[model samples]
Target: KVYDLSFFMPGQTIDAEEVEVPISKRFVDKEGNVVPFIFKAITTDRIDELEKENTTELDSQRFYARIAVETTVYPTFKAKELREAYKTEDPVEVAKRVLSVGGEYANWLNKAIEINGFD
Candidate 1:
């Protein structure tokens, strides 16, 4: 079935829903409880902007790291405590470091891409 014409109008639809994904076992709280990370789908425009921001063939790592940072909703990668714990103030760098543990970055990236509607 096709969507009604009115459904195509501006403001007729809401933003994509946020999804909670348990990406790793390494993310734990002070009580040693595993905390699942949250992610949200990003817009194509934002993705395009990120692409332009990292214009290099070997910058894919940074690109994907940025994507993780942009989509993460939990632990707030930008939090000062988190950044200080990671020894970096950059949110993207924080994501890269966290996701790099045990090669979990690949899985995290794949999940992020999947939630963003990419294959």
Candidate 2:
């Protein structure tokens, strides 16, 4: 069984995810100047552990808080479609093609990942 959890993801908490952030990208366009944008995901994970390290009962309240959006992006893009999207000249076509095959990896993370089977 999977549990859904929410917490005040601290701004200072240094985790693998936090360590790498604001992933940037550049794709060569027809003009060859290269277009760029910051790719990112706002992630929420299931908090399996409930720690009361320094919390008052009132501070604990029900549970969970929406923290800052992860400026960090998913590190690897080994998927063919994603790679093509980043490498291709046609962004629209790449975006369309990527989703169809990018589905199978079901995501249990908090938000419904737009990836097909992931949702």
Candidate 3:
């Protein structure tokens, strides 16, 4: 899940000082485990169609989370897998207890990511 620093309060946010554009994404599922990921900029396209219709070029950060749903790439692979696994099992209480970033785990068991790039 790509979340922003604005989602959580400064005082209540986890490591408030570290939150930003979410260059990295990780998870801790209902099993009380932590998973790590490395996010990437897939396709950067300026949707001019929208501007043509609105008659204005609205500056926006175009982020394609899943450029090709069939392909597993970078953090998208881990993020997508976690979602599938999470759905199969019970509801997961997402946590941000990082082992490397936060250093709070005895054994790290992140979702296995298989790199897949379509052209």
Best by lDDT: 1
Candidate 2: C-alpha lDDT:
0.31
lDDT of 2 by residue, 1-119 (tens): 76644443665554432232211223346886534322233444422222242245534322222111122133233445565657754432333333333331111112222211234
Q: Which stretches of candidate 1 lie over 4 Å from their true place?
A: 1-4, 29-33, 56-58
lDDT of 3 by residue, 28-67 (tens): 5588554433322222232233334334443321111122
Between candidates 1 and 2, the lDDT winner = 1
- Model 2: worst 10 consecutive residues (lDDT sum): 63-72
Lowest lDDT block of 10, candidate 3: 105-114
Off by over 4 Å in 2: 1-26, 46-76, 81-119
Query: In model 2, what lDDT does residue 50 have?
Result: 24
| Residue 110 Cα positional deviation in candidate 3, in Å, after optimal superposition | 21
State, as a TM-score between 0 and 1, how close model 3 is to the true structure.
0.21
Spell out the clash pairs found in candidate 1: none
Residue 20 Cα positional deviation in candidate 3, in Å, after optimal superposition: 15
Give TM per candidate: 0.78, 0.21, 0.21
Q: Top TM-score: which candidate number?
A: 1
Model 2 clash pairs? 6-64, 21-72, 22-71
